[PDB]
Amino acid sequence: MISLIAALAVDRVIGMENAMPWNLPADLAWFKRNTLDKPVIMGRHTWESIGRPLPGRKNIILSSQPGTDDRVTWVKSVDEAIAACGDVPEIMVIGGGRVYEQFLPKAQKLYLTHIDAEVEGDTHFPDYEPDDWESVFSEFHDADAQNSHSYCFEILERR
Ligand SMILES: NC(=O)c1ccc[n+]([C@@H]2O[C@H](COP(=O)([O-])OP(=O)(O)OC[C@H]3O[C@@H](n4cnc5c(N)ncnc54)[C@H](OP(=O)(O)O)[C@@H]3O)[C@@H](O)[C@H]2O)c1
Ligand SMILES: CN(Cc1cnc2nc(N)nc(N)c2n1)c1ccc(C(=O)N[C@@H](CCC(=O)O)C(=O)O)cc1
Ligand SMILES: [Mn+2]
């Protein structure tokens, strides 16, 4: 099954100039918890902003261009990306915007982190139809010493 995993600030902003403005260590924690030991799909920019392979995960990168690093797996299409994953129970799509736009309709579950933060971004999460989805998990957190804003973890399943 395909799942989208993402972190959103105010107004579905997800990035700015190839990066994430805020710093929310609890989000990284949770991102890692959720993707560890599973395959992660990500676009070329996102990989670039990551600058390295994520351990304990099969890294799959989508580019129309040929690979330039054997540490990860390169693919040139959404189909191939998914085939490259093999037979596993869950595929984690991690970004960025274009990639999410493409996998949304094929996805059965959303892992969203709602961040209480106002940032001028240049990239946004897709506009998805709430009707279609169901909140199965929700947990709120106030900002703290490690985390500068309040946030909320959420899991939704397509009805
Ligand atoms: N907050 C979040 O959770 C989160 C998670 C990830 C990323 N982000 C942010 O997202 C922004 C980067 O997002 P982005 O939309 O600019 O880039 P992206 O989605 O990561 O990368 C886009 C690219 O991936 C390739 N690609 C995508 N679909 C393809 C397909 N069907 N076939 C072949 N290649 C395909 C293309 O590479 P080629 O040009 O080489 O073909 C295209 O340039 C950054 O700001 C990052 O910080 C946020
Ligand atoms: C660029 N970026 C993409 C990124 C970041 N936060 C997100 N947060 C959420 N919720 N969802 C995403 N898709 C997301 N994607 C990154 C950057 C660094 C690491 C990273 O180091 N991850 C460690 C986290 C633990 C550590 O901080 O050492 C891991 O192993 O998963 C991951 C994603
Ligand atoms: Mn149902």
Side-chain angles (χ1 to χ4, degrees):
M1 170 199 11
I2 294 145
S3 309
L4 269 55
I5 191 189
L8 289 50
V10 180
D11 272 359
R12 318 175 344 257
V13 172
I14 53 156
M16 173 68 193
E17 293 183 314
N18 212 227
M20 296 185 308
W22 62 89
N23 158 98
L24 272 217
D27 183 65
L28 282 225
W30 153 282
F31 156 99
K32 175 198 202 153
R33 168 199 179 186
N34 295 295
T35 70
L36 198 90
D37 283 331
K38 322 175 176 147
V40 303
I41 303 167
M42 87 197 72
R44 205 250 314 160
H45 298 124
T46 297
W47 161 235
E48 283 172 3
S49 85
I50 304 179
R52 26 135 276 270
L54 300 151
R57 293 149 286 190
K58 188 189 167 165
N59 289 217
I60 298 170
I61 321 303
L62 269 147
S63 202
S64 67
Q65 258 52 49
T68 289
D69 185 331
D70 291 319
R71 297 175 306 158
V72 296
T73 294
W74 308 76
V75 309
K76 303 147 201 294
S77 81
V78 155
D79 281 297
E80 172 170 39
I82 310 199
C85 282
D87 322 275
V88 302
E90 196 180 17
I91 295 156
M92 314 295 297
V93 164
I94 70 172
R98 296 303 282 170
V99 173
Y100 281 141
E101 204 196 319
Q102 291 177 65
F103 279 90
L104 181 76
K106 310 190 56 57
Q108 292 56 46
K109 171 141 175 173
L110 307 180
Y111 301 81
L112 309 158
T113 297
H114 308 281
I115 304 174
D116 199 35
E118 182 266 307
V119 96
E120 278 167 6
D122 57 14
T123 306
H124 308 247
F125 196 73
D127 196 35
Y128 64 103
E129 181 42 89
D131 284 355
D132 295 5
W133 297 87
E134 171 180 357
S135 175
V136 316
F137 162 101
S138 194
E139 169 191 292
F140 182 63
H141 294 252
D142 271 318
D144 63 26
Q146 307 163 48
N147 306 291
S148 170
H149 300 286
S150 55
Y151 46 110
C152 190
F153 303 126
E154 165 163 61
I155 304 189
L156 314 155
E157 301 184 340
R158 187 182 298 276
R159 280 188 187 293

